[PDB]
Structures are given as structure tokens and as C-alpha cells.
């Protein structure tokens, strides 16, 4: 182990000098990484070369493989299947997987693929939400719709940090994904939102009820993505009173304002009587509610309503234009606390250290031109 070479090996075993040196070093490295040997340099160990030791750098053949992959990806690309291929492509692959391949088999499989292509290609974008405070940070989520009565909704998203030349990189874009949820929104009153770092959809639905004279009842439904890609059931919130309070016309939907709020760990939902232009919402009375992670629902008071309005109305849809809501904030997004260290180190002679301390509370002042952060570490 010390000399990284045996001496107990048969004379009948041969090697090359380059190979021996390689084998020797690989053993050297393993002993250092495993801390068999004391006082290895942790700085060096943390370098990417060693991070990718177990996979790729530890063995010649895997090393050569990955380095060559970058230079000759064509030796590794298999048209049969690729990373990130669409579901339409999976369907095609499966469709032509049998041994009986001829033009009829293939052409039908192709037209099947193409049918799905059109269904995706023509998706109509209905609404969107941006998961940030600032327009250039984070990513935008979109909801689109297949052109059928009682049709299907799809979603996709784009990364704004990948907007790199007045244009989005192809990598910026995510593919369309299906929403397996019974969504039947009224006049497209629907928004994606991110809450608790999770994708939720909220929408309003209209029910006709006889009083005879008929009238309408409105309900707010919420649904969210599960970890396996499936969707949960919708949750119904009775907002009929809020819709009723708004002086909406017979052929209108309340505007739906909805965004997550890091402060108060809550989803902020407000409904409004839509105006021709945003200036008119400056003093509008918003009818809202809070939705909590546990699906608790609380009415929003007029005071709360006015505050959220003053800091958000600039983003409300008008009768002339759709807007993408950002994350709600008054001014700054500041963590409520910090438990995760970014870094650390040992004191002299490795006998003691500062470790697992924290910043359990962060408060702040934000007066005009006066930002103060209060830390209680």
C-alpha cells in the first residue's frame, strides 16, 4: 500500500510502465479519498476531478469514454432513443418496434406521430405565471389548451436566466406536459401559480342554478402536481359571495389575481371587476382570500386587500391585455431565518470549531431609502 506496487506477485505477471503508474496512482487516490491515510488535502479532494472519481475518472476506460464522448458524440448517439425525447417519440418507437416493418407499418406509425404532433403544435396559450419578483429572474410557467370541447390542458415553462441575447436559448424551454385534471374553467379564468415551490392551478367555474329565474354560482377550484407527475384532486373553495360582491357584467369573469407569497407562507387570491386600464385598479376594492398549504381558507380583510392591491395592481389584467403575475412582495425578499451553512472550517490543530450555529430570526426595516437587517444569531 505504501509503495503502490506489489512484491508478492508472481514473476509470470507482466505489465507496462504506463499501466503500472496508472494503477499505482489510482490506489493512491483511493486511500486518500477514504481517509485511510491521515491529513489529506480537503481542498484538492473537493475539486471536480475527484468528485467525478467514482464515476468516470477512477478508470481508464470510463475516463476515455467521457472525454471521447464530448469529441465524438456520434459514436454514442443511438437514434432508437434519446435523453429528453418527447412522449410522441416514445409512442413512435413503440409503434415501429415489431419485426414486420414495411412501408405500411411505418407510414401508419408516422401519421400517428404526426397526429400527436399537430395536437401539440396547435396548443393555445391561455395564461401564465412568473416564479420570481423580477421579470428577468426565475422562470415563467404557461398553461395551454388543446382544441377540443371539454379539452385538455397542458403546461410548459421557460428559464429567464437562459435569455442570453435578447432571445431565449432553446435550452430555456421546457416541453409541454399534460395536466391530468378535470378542469372546466369559465371564460378561461385560470392561472398557474407556484406555491410552496410546487405547481398549482387555480380556476373559476360557473354553475347555472334555478331560483323561476336562473342565475349563476361561482366556485374556485385548486389542484396541484404530485411528485410522480400525476395530479391531485381539485379542492373547492366557495367564493360565490366574492364574485357576487364584485359588480361584474352578465358576460364577464372576475379578473383572477393570484400569486404565491413567501411572506406569510401563503397563496394570495384576489378577484376583481376588470377595467380598461390599470390606472383604474389603483383604488379598486379587491375581494380575496388566503389559501394555506393545508388548504385552510381565510377571508381577506379590506385592509389586507388594499395593501396587496397597492403593491400588485400594476400587474392586473385589463380588458385590453393579459398579464403574467409575479410573486408577491412589498419590496425585498429576505429569508425569515437561516439554518443552512454556506461554509465552515476547523480551528487550530483541529481541536475545536464553530459549527451548527444559526440565524434563527431575520427581521427587517424598509423605510424609504433605509434598509436595515436585524439578525438574532
Amino acid at each position: 500500500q505504501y509503495l503502490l506496487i506489489d512484491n508478492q506477485v508472481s514473476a509470470a505477471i507482466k505489465t507496462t510502465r504506463i499501466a503500472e503508474a496508472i494503477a499505482s496512482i489510482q490506489l493512491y487516490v483511493n486511500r486518500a479519498l477514504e481517509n485511510v491515510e491521515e491529513n489529506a488535502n480537503s481542498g484538492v479532494i473537493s475539486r471536480q476531478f475527484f468528485i467525478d472519481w467514482d464515476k468516470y475518472n477512477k478508470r481508464y476506460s470510463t475516463w476515455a469514454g467521457v472525454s471521447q464522448l464530448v469529441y465524438y458524440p456520434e459514436n454514442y448517439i443511438d437514434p432508437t432513443m434519446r435523453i429528453g425525447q418527447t412522449k410522441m417519440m416514445d409512442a413512435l418507437l413503440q409503434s415501429v418496434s415489431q419485426s414486420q416493418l414495411n412501408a405500411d407499418t411505418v407510414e401508419d406509425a408516422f401519421m400517428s406521430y404526426l397526429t400527436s404532433f399537430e395536437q401539440v403544435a396547435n396548443l393555445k396559450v391561455i395564461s401564465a405565471y412568473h416564479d420570481n419578483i423580477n421579470n428577468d429572474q426565475g422562470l415563467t410557467y404557461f398553461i395551454g389548451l388543446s382544441e377540443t370541447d371539454a379539452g385538455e390542458y397542458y403546461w410548459r415553462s421557460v428559464d429567464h436566466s437562459k435569455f442570453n441575447d435578447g432571445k431565449f436559448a432553446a435550452n430555456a424551454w421546457s416541453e409541454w406536459h399534460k395536466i391530468d385534471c378535470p378542469i372546466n374553467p369559465y371564460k378561461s379564468t385560470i392561472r398557474p401559480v407556484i406555491y410552496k415551490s410546487r405547481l398549482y392551478l387555480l380556476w373559476l367555474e360557473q354553475k347555472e342554478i334555478t331560483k323561476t329565474e336562473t342565475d349563476y354560482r361561482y366556485e374556485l377550484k385548486l389542484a396541484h402536481i404530485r411528485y410522480d407527475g400525476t395530479w391531485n384532486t381539485p379542492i373547492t373553495f366557495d367564493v360565490n359571495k366574492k364574485i357576487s360582491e364584485l359588480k361584474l357584467e352578465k358576460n364577464r369573469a372576475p379578473g383572477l389575481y393570484c400569486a404565491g407569497y413567501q411572506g406569510e407562507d401563503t397563496l394570495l387570491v384576489m378577484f376583481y371587476n376588470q377595467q380598461d386600464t390599470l390606472d383604474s385598479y389603483k383604488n379598486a376594492s379587491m375581494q380575496g382570500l388566503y389559501i394555506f398549504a393545508d388548504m385552510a381558507s381565510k377571508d381577506m380583510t379590506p385592509e389586507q386587500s388594499n395593501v396587496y392591491r397597492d403593491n400588485s395592481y400594476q400587474q392586473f389584467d385589463t380588458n385590453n391585455v393579459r398579464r403574467v403575475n409575479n410573486r408577491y412582495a412589498e419590496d425585498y425578499e429576505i429569508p425569515s431565518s437561516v439554518s443552512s451553512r454556506k461554509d465552515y472550517g476547523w480551528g487550530d490543530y483541529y481541536l475545536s470549531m464553530v459549527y451548527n450555529g444559526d440565524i434563527p430570526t431575520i427581521n427587517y426595516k424598509a423605510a424609504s431609502s433605509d434598509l436595515k437587517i436585524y439578525i438574532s444569531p
Binding site: 514473476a11 505489465t15 503500472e20 496508472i22 489529506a40 471536480q48 469529441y71
Partner: protein, 145 residues
């Protein structure tokens, strides 16, 4: 992170030049792959004609050869322990810094055991301050303890 991005970008730049410059693609012709000479000339001026020096697998000189692998391993591995440590790579095996990346070291096979004896025998000769390996063997013959 920007420093890491710089390496990735540097690799993309270099690889594109070396990839397009490859005679294999140019001999195929029909591929219609442009290998713009402005970038190739600049590169070759900085790397002394290197982009044109494509080699067969199996040469020690290849960037994917085991010598290239050895070079990378040594370059990083040598820094795992302090230079004044008992576990320093060059302390244990000083012949590594000495050894050249020769084609003959790559192709000629020899007993692993003979390499082992070579190392121990040189180490003993050195410590005992002897002229040669036959003085080491003469010495060992009376080394009762």
C-alpha cells in the same frame, strides 16, 4: 461559477476547432463541414500546428491515451497530500516524476515483479549509499538481522 463556465466555454471553443479540422470529415467531403481557417490558423499558431496532428488510437501521444490519463491523474493526485508529508505521492514513488511518457513504456510488457524489485533495489542502494545493485546484493548476503 463564472470561472467554471469559462472552462466549459474554453473546451467548446477548442473542441469545435479540432473537430472541424479533422481530415476524416474533410476526406468524406459530402458532409460539407466547414473548418474555417481563420480559427484554425489562430489555433495552430498558438499550439504549434497541433490541430493538424491527428493521431491513431494507440499512440502515447493521443489525448485519450493512457498517457493522457496518467498525466491527468498525476497532476491532480500529486496535490492530495502536503509536499512535506509521508504520504506525498513523490515521496512514495519519486520515479513517477522521472518517468517519461514514451511509446515504449506503453507497449512493452515486463514483469510487474521486476518493476517492484527495481524500486526497492534502487531505494536500498540509495539509503545504503552503495555504488550499484551488486553491492546491494553483496551487502544483503551478510545482513544477519
Amino acid at each position: 461559477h463564472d470561472a467554471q463556465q469559462a472552462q466549459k466555454d474554453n473546451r467548446l471553443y477548442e473542441a469545435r476547432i479540432l473537430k472541424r479540422a479533422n481530415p476524416q470529415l474533410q476526406n468524406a467531403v459530402h458532409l460539407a463541414i466547414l473548418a474555417p481557417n481563420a480559427e484554425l490558423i489562430g489555433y495552430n499558431n498558438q499550439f504549434s500546428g497541433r490541430a493538424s496532428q491527428y493521431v491513431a488510437p494507440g499512440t502515447v501521444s493521443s489525448m485519450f491515451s493512457p498517457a493522457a490519463y496518467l498525466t491527468e491523474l498525476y497532476r491532480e493526485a500529486r496535490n492530495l497530500h502536503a509536499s512535506d508529508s509521508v504520504y506525498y505521492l513523490d515521496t512514495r514513488r519519486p520515479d513517477l516524476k522521472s518517468m517519461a511518457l514514451s511509446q515504449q513504456n506503453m507497449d512493452i510488457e515486463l514483469s510487474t515483479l521486476s518493476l517492484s524489485n527495481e524500486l526497492l533495489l534502487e531505494s536500498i542502494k540509495t539509503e545504503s549509499k552503495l555504488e550499484n545493485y551488486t553491492k546491494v546484493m553483496e551487502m544483503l548476503s551478510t545482513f544477519r538481522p
